Amino acid sequence: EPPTLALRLKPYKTAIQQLRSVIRALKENTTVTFLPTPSLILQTVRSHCVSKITFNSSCLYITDKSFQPKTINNSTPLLGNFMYLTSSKDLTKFYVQDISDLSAKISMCAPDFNMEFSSACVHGQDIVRESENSAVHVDLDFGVVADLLKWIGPTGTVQILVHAGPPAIKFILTNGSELEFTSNNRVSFHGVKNMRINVQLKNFYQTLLNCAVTKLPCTLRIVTEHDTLLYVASRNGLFAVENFLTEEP
Amino acid sequence: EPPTLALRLKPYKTAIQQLRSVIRALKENTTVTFLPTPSLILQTVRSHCVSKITFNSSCLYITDKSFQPKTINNSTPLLGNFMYLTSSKDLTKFYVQDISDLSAKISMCAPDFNMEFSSACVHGQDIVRESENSAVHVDLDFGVVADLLKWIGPTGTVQILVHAGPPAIKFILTNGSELEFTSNNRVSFHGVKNMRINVQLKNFYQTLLNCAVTKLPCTLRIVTEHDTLLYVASRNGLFAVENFLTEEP
Amino acid sequence: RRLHLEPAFLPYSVKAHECC
Amino acid sequence: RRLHLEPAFLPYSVKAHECC
């Protein structure tokens, strides 16, 4: 039996339903990485934004740890959106086998059906990762995230201003409207530094929506180790949603 | 090597593109039958209408004639619309193997991909077939079909009246509007008998649209061997479209 | 036998196996 | 290497094989 990575259906099904919106909107700029951890990472790449969804160990089962990491594009030659297909309510078994170093053999089952598909592997795919520490790090209650979404929602940029002492975070719109959160029971400020970044409103809003699916707190960090990036993430017991946005001039 | 039925892609691709509308609208009431003829039959069943699409020998290739007829529902457990999937512009190989008497093993290829699926077989499926001769048989130019479509188009029933001598065919609407075609260069009357049938306008209109995809003549017959049925069909060098409608009270 | 036909169509039908 | 990241993201990325 070749190294096999299987999905534990109960939690995996719960997970994709919460991510339905995200999964359904995936296009051609997304990769799926299967790791022997076990782990499943979906990474969507845009010019100034990288979105990543990581399913944790509780959603997977791995037999043999010699399973070589496998990466494929989500846009499959005849089936189209791969992850969307795994969201089918009929799915009863889903597993990936490491037969060749060149492809991933994916098997799926449903009541009186079974299917197998071999997808060529992508080599050297770069996966964006959250930095150890950073210039700014704030945690926000889900309710704060909801406030931000409500305030922004139905091009342009949004300025994110962070203040030292007392700690504070402000979101500024081009029209001179500002939403601020001071240190209190709804937001925890770990690392703070006086700085202001500018990000694309659309990607920022989209990032907040992606994180909101957890209905749990979010983390916002501004990293300056290299080029300035804004990091917005949230997680639950099944997956973690992470987004990295670059600055707009 | 097990008995294999393969699709000759050039003509098959030409065929499904002409049938795009029909293929895309298929739901849960359609079966796909693979025959060693070779032949591929799609049959859609409704209460007062049965629609059948038969792909001829020129669209298929069969190795071994001991290939047992295989029938599956078009609505596949995870892939959804089976025939729609075969319409993918990326398809480079499509074949069905007769491994077991219980299922059909379908294989599909695309540039750096290959997929296989096993669909449980339907047993004892009844396939409606055109009768040797009939009470009425008229052939109509495509232009006549276009006139009918234009006249009806943007519930209710439509009366079809046929006259003996001189031969004539009339389509009557509830609002007292009638469209008639007399024996001439556009319509050929083979068998005629004085009779009038009533069919559902919706299924009739839909039947005309299905036949119109050939841009070639149509055949209209009224069969009375058993229960009265209206038969409307058309064909080209790749497939034949046939519809059987029952009478409305 | 998956898709059942209304009685009116039965006499005009044949089993898939005896088809062409 | 399928999906290329803009230069700004490269230093914050690792290859899929050295991932968790």
Short mmCIF file of all heavy atoms in Angstrom, two decimals, chain B residues 29-30 35 37 45 47 122-127 129 131 223 226-227 244 246, chain C residues 1-6 8-20, unseen atoms left out:
data_model
loop_
_atom_site.label_atom_id
_atom_site.label_comp_id
_atom_site.label_asym_id
_atom_site.label_seq_id
_atom_site.Cartn_x
_atom_site.Cartn_y
_atom_site.Cartn_z
N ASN B 29 -33.60 12.91 -14.66
CA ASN B 29 -34.40 11.97 -15.42
C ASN B 29 -33.82 11.55 -16.77
O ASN B 29 -34.56 11.41 -17.75
CB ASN B 29 -35.79 12.59 -15.60
CG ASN B 29 -35.74 13.94 -16.35
OD1 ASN B 29 -34.77 14.70 -16.25
ND2 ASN B 29 -36.80 14.24 -17.11
N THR B 30 -32.50 11.35 -16.82
CA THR B 30 -31.85 10.96 -18.05
C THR B 30 -30.89 9.80 -17.89
O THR B 30 -30.16 9.75 -16.91
CB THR B 30 -31.09 12.16 -18.64
OG1 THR B 30 -32.01 13.22 -18.91
CG2 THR B 30 -30.52 11.83 -20.03
N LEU B 35 -23.84 1.05 -26.36
CA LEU B 35 -24.07 -0.21 -27.08
C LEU B 35 -22.90 -0.63 -27.95
O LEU B 35 -22.16 0.22 -28.45
CB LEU B 35 -25.35 -0.10 -27.92
CG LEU B 35 -26.66 0.28 -27.23
CD1 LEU B 35 -27.70 0.70 -28.26
CD2 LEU B 35 -27.21 -0.86 -26.40
N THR B 37 -22.92 -1.62 -30.89
CA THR B 37 -23.23 -1.34 -32.31
C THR B 37 -22.12 -0.79 -33.24
O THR B 37 -21.96 -1.34 -34.31
CB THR B 37 -24.47 -0.42 -32.44
OG1 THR B 37 -25.55 -0.97 -31.69
CG2 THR B 37 -24.96 -0.39 -33.88
N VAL B 45 -36.75 11.02 -19.78
CA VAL B 45 -38.12 10.64 -19.52
C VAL B 45 -38.93 11.65 -18.69
O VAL B 45 -38.53 12.05 -17.61
CB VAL B 45 -38.15 9.28 -18.75
CG1 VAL B 45 -39.57 8.85 -18.44
CG2 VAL B 45 -37.44 8.19 -19.55
N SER B 47 -43.33 12.71 -17.92
CA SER B 47 -44.65 12.07 -17.94
C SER B 47 -45.34 11.90 -19.31
O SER B 47 -45.89 10.82 -19.61
CB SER B 47 -45.60 12.82 -16.99
OG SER B 47 -45.24 12.55 -15.65
N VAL B 122 -27.69 0.35 -14.51
CA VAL B 122 -29.12 0.32 -14.38
C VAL B 122 -29.49 -0.94 -15.16
O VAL B 122 -28.93 -1.18 -16.21
CB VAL B 122 -29.74 1.55 -15.04
CG1 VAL B 122 -31.20 1.33 -15.33
CG2 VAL B 122 -29.51 2.79 -14.17
N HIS B 123 -30.42 -1.73 -14.65
CA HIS B 123 -30.82 -2.94 -15.35
C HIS B 123 -32.25 -2.78 -15.84
O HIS B 123 -33.03 -2.06 -15.22
CB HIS B 123 -30.67 -4.18 -14.45
CG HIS B 123 -29.24 -4.50 -14.14
ND1 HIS B 123 -28.40 -5.13 -15.04
CD2 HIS B 123 -28.50 -4.28 -13.02
CE1 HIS B 123 -27.21 -5.28 -14.49
NE2 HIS B 123 -27.24 -4.77 -13.27
N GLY B 124 -32.57 -3.44 -16.95
CA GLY B 124 -33.91 -3.38 -17.52
C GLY B 124 -34.48 -2.04 -17.93
O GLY B 124 -35.70 -1.88 -17.90
N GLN B 125 -33.63 -1.09 -18.31
CA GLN B 125 -34.10 0.22 -18.73
C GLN B 125 -34.84 0.06 -20.06
O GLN B 125 -34.35 -0.62 -20.95
CB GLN B 125 -32.94 1.21 -18.91
CG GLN B 125 -33.35 2.60 -19.44
CD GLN B 125 -34.32 3.32 -18.49
OE1 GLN B 125 -34.06 3.41 -17.29
NE2 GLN B 125 -35.43 3.82 -19.02
N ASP B 126 -36.00 0.70 -20.17
CA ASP B 126 -36.78 0.63 -21.40
C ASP B 126 -36.41 1.80 -22.24
O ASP B 126 -36.34 2.93 -21.75
CB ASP B 126 -38.28 0.64 -21.11
CG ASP B 126 -38.71 -0.54 -20.28
OD1 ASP B 126 -38.71 -1.67 -20.82
OD2 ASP B 126 -39.05 -0.44 -19.08
N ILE B 127 -36.18 1.54 -23.52
CA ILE B 127 -35.81 2.58 -24.45
C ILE B 127 -36.94 2.72 -25.48
O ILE B 127 -37.25 1.76 -26.18
CB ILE B 127 -34.46 2.20 -25.15
CG1 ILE B 127 -33.33 2.03 -24.13
CG2 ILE B 127 -34.08 3.20 -26.23
CD1 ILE B 127 -32.75 3.33 -23.61
N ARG B 129 -38.75 3.46 -28.87
CA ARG B 129 -38.28 3.34 -30.25
C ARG B 129 -39.34 3.72 -31.30
O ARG B 129 -40.53 3.49 -31.09
CB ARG B 129 -37.72 1.92 -30.48
CG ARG B 129 -38.21 1.19 -31.71
CD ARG B 129 -37.67 -0.23 -31.87
NE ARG B 129 -36.75 -0.33 -33.00
CZ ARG B 129 -35.72 -1.17 -33.10
NH1 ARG B 129 -35.44 -2.02 -32.11
NH2 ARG B 129 -34.96 -1.15 -34.19
N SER B 131 -41.68 3.58 -34.41
CA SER B 131 -42.42 2.49 -35.04
C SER B 131 -42.23 2.39 -36.55
O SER B 131 -42.09 3.42 -37.22
CB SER B 131 -43.91 2.63 -34.72
OG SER B 131 -44.10 3.08 -33.40
N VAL B 223 -48.49 8.08 -34.40
CA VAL B 223 -48.59 6.63 -34.31
C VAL B 223 -49.82 6.26 -33.54
O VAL B 223 -50.12 6.87 -32.52
CB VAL B 223 -47.33 6.06 -33.60
CG1 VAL B 223 -47.27 4.57 -33.72
CG2 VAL B 223 -46.09 6.66 -34.21
N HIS B 226 -50.78 1.69 -30.62
CA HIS B 226 -51.21 1.51 -29.24
C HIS B 226 -51.78 2.87 -28.85
O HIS B 226 -52.67 3.37 -29.53
CB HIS B 226 -50.05 1.05 -28.35
CG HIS B 226 -49.40 -0.21 -28.83
ND1 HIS B 226 -50.00 -1.45 -28.73
CD2 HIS B 226 -48.19 -0.42 -29.40
CE1 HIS B 226 -49.19 -2.37 -29.23
NE2 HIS B 226 -48.09 -1.77 -29.65
N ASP B 227 -51.30 3.48 -27.77
CA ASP B 227 -51.82 4.79 -27.37
C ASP B 227 -51.28 5.76 -28.40
O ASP B 227 -50.16 5.58 -28.91
CB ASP B 227 -51.35 5.19 -25.97
CG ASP B 227 -52.23 4.63 -24.86
OD1 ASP B 227 -53.19 3.83 -25.03
OD2 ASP B 227 -51.96 4.99 -23.69
N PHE B 244 -41.01 11.62 -28.38
CA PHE B 244 -42.30 10.94 -28.37
C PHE B 244 -43.14 11.63 -27.32
O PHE B 244 -42.77 11.67 -26.14
CB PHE B 244 -42.15 9.46 -28.01
CG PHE B 244 -41.06 8.75 -28.77
CD1 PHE B 244 -39.72 9.00 -28.50
CD2 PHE B 244 -41.39 7.83 -29.77
CE1 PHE B 244 -38.69 8.34 -29.21
CE2 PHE B 244 -40.38 7.16 -30.49
CZ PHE B 244 -39.01 7.42 -30.21
N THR B 246 -47.20 12.13 -25.76
CA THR B 246 -48.51 11.50 -25.65
C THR B 246 -49.53 12.62 -25.76
O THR B 246 -49.17 13.78 -25.70
CB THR B 246 -48.71 10.77 -24.32
OG1 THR B 246 -48.46 11.66 -23.24
CG2 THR B 246 -47.67 9.75 -24.12
N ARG C 1 -34.79 -1.03 -12.28
CA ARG C 1 -35.00 -0.50 -13.69
C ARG C 1 -35.08 1.04 -13.79
O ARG C 1 -35.88 1.59 -14.54
CB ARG C 1 -36.19 -1.21 -14.41
CG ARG C 1 -36.00 -2.75 -14.47
CD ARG C 1 -37.05 -3.55 -15.25
NE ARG C 1 -36.62 -4.95 -15.40
CZ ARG C 1 -37.34 -6.03 -15.11
NH1 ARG C 1 -38.58 -5.92 -14.62
NH2 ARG C 1 -36.82 -7.22 -15.30
N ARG C 2 -34.22 1.71 -13.00
CA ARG C 2 -34.12 3.18 -12.93
C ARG C 2 -35.28 4.09 -13.39
O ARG C 2 -36.19 4.36 -12.59
CB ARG C 2 -32.76 3.73 -13.37
CG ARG C 2 -32.20 4.81 -12.45
CD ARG C 2 -31.78 4.28 -11.07
NE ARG C 2 -32.83 3.44 -10.48
CZ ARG C 2 -33.21 3.48 -9.22
NH1 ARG C 2 -32.63 4.32 -8.36
NH2 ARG C 2 -34.18 2.67 -8.80
N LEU C 3 -35.27 4.56 -14.64
CA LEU C 3 -36.36 5.44 -15.11
C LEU C 3 -37.58 4.76 -15.73
O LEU C 3 -37.53 4.29 -16.88
CB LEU C 3 -35.83 6.54 -16.04
CG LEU C 3 -34.60 7.33 -15.56
CD1 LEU C 3 -34.28 8.43 -16.54
CD2 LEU C 3 -34.76 7.91 -14.15
N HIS C 4 -38.67 4.71 -14.97
CA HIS C 4 -39.92 4.09 -15.43
C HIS C 4 -40.68 4.99 -16.38
O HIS C 4 -40.80 6.19 -16.15
CB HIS C 4 -40.80 3.73 -14.25
CG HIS C 4 -40.32 2.53 -13.52
ND1 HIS C 4 -39.50 2.61 -12.41
CD2 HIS C 4 -40.52 1.21 -13.74
CE1 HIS C 4 -39.23 1.40 -11.98
NE2 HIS C 4 -39.84 0.53 -12.77
N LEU C 5 -41.18 4.39 -17.46
CA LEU C 5 -41.93 5.12 -18.46
C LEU C 5 -43.40 5.01 -18.14
O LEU C 5 -43.85 4.02 -17.56
CB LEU C 5 -41.71 4.54 -19.87
CG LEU C 5 -40.31 4.20 -20.38
CD1 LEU C 5 -40.36 3.45 -21.70
CD2 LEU C 5 -39.52 5.45 -20.54
N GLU C 6 -44.16 6.02 -18.51
CA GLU C 6 -45.58 6.02 -18.26
C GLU C 6 -46.11 4.84 -19.12
O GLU C 6 -45.51 4.52 -20.15
CB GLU C 6 -46.18 7.37 -18.68
CG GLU C 6 -46.17 8.43 -17.57
CD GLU C 6 -47.02 8.06 -16.35
OE1 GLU C 6 -48.27 8.03 -16.46
OE2 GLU C 6 -46.44 7.80 -15.27
N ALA C 8 -48.33 4.54 -21.37
CA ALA C 8 -48.51 4.86 -22.78
C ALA C 8 -47.26 4.62 -23.65
O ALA C 8 -47.40 4.35 -24.84
CB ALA C 8 -48.99 6.30 -22.94
N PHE C 9 -46.06 4.71 -23.06
CA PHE C 9 -44.81 4.50 -23.81
C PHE C 9 -44.27 3.08 -23.83
O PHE C 9 -43.54 2.71 -24.75
CB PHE C 9 -43.68 5.38 -23.27
CG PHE C 9 -43.92 6.84 -23.41
CD1 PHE C 9 -44.31 7.60 -22.31
CD2 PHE C 9 -43.76 7.47 -24.65
CE1 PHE C 9 -44.54 8.97 -22.43
CE2 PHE C 9 -43.98 8.84 -24.79
CZ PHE C 9 -44.38 9.60 -23.68
N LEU C 10 -44.63 2.28 -22.83
CA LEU C 10 -44.16 0.89 -22.74
C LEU C 10 -44.24 0.04 -24.02
O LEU C 10 -43.23 -0.53 -24.42
CB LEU C 10 -44.79 0.15 -21.55
CG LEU C 10 -44.32 0.57 -20.15
CD1 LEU C 10 -45.02 -0.24 -19.10
CD2 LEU C 10 -42.80 0.43 -20.00
N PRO C 11 -45.41 -0.04 -24.67
CA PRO C 11 -45.53 -0.84 -25.89
C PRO C 11 -44.65 -0.35 -27.04
O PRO C 11 -44.44 -1.10 -27.98
CB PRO C 11 -47.02 -0.69 -26.26
CG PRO C 11 -47.67 -0.30 -24.99
CD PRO C 11 -46.69 0.61 -24.33
N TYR C 12 -44.13 0.86 -26.95
CA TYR C 12 -43.28 1.38 -28.01
C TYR C 12 -41.83 1.30 -27.60
O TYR C 12 -40.95 1.85 -28.26
CB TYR C 12 -43.65 2.84 -28.27
CG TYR C 12 -45.05 3.08 -28.80
CD1 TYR C 12 -46.06 3.56 -27.96
CD2 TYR C 12 -45.36 2.84 -30.15
CE1 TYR C 12 -47.35 3.80 -28.45
CE2 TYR C 12 -46.66 3.08 -30.65
CZ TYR C 12 -47.65 3.55 -29.80
OH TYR C 12 -48.92 3.78 -30.27
N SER C 13 -41.56 0.61 -26.50
CA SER C 13 -40.19 0.49 -26.03
C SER C 13 -39.66 -0.93 -26.03
O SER C 13 -40.41 -1.90 -26.01
CB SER C 13 -40.08 1.07 -24.61
OG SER C 13 -40.51 0.12 -23.62
N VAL C 14 -38.34 -1.02 -26.05
CA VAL C 14 -37.64 -2.29 -26.04
C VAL C 14 -36.56 -2.14 -24.97
O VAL C 14 -36.21 -1.03 -24.57
CB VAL C 14 -37.02 -2.64 -27.43
CG1 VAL C 14 -38.12 -2.95 -28.46
CG2 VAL C 14 -36.07 -1.52 -27.93
N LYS C 15 -36.03 -3.24 -24.49
CA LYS C 15 -35.00 -3.17 -23.47
C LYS C 15 -33.71 -2.70 -24.12
O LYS C 15 -33.44 -3.00 -25.28
CB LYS C 15 -34.80 -4.52 -22.79
CG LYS C 15 -35.99 -5.00 -21.99
CD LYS C 15 -36.23 -4.12 -20.76
CE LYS C 15 -37.11 -4.82 -19.75
NZ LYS C 15 -37.97 -3.84 -19.04
N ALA C 16 -32.92 -1.95 -23.36
CA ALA C 16 -31.65 -1.43 -23.84
C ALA C 16 -30.79 -2.54 -24.48
O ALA C 16 -30.14 -2.31 -25.50
CB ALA C 16 -30.92 -0.74 -22.71
N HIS C 17 -30.77 -3.73 -23.89
CA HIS C 17 -29.97 -4.83 -24.45
C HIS C 17 -30.32 -5.29 -25.88
O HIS C 17 -29.46 -5.79 -26.60
CB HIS C 17 -29.84 -6.01 -23.46
CG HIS C 17 -31.07 -6.86 -23.34
ND1 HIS C 17 -31.53 -7.33 -22.12
CD2 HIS C 17 -31.93 -7.33 -24.27
CE1 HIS C 17 -32.62 -8.05 -22.31
NE2 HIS C 17 -32.89 -8.07 -23.60
N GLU C 18 -31.57 -5.13 -26.29
CA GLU C 18 -32.00 -5.54 -27.63
C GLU C 18 -32.07 -4.30 -28.53
O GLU C 18 -32.84 -4.26 -29.49
CB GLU C 18 -33.35 -6.27 -27.56
N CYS C 19 -31.25 -3.31 -28.21
CA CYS C 19 -31.17 -2.05 -28.95
C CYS C 19 -30.02 -1.96 -29.97
O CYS C 19 -29.12 -2.81 -29.99
CB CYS C 19 -31.04 -0.92 -27.95
SG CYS C 19 -32.50 0.10 -27.84
N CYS C 20 -30.07 -0.91 -30.80
CA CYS C 20 -29.06 -0.65 -31.84
C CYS C 20 -28.57 0.81 -32.00
O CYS C 20 -29.19 1.84 -31.69
CB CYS C 20 -29.55 -1.17 -33.20
SG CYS C 20 -29.23 -2.93 -33.46
#
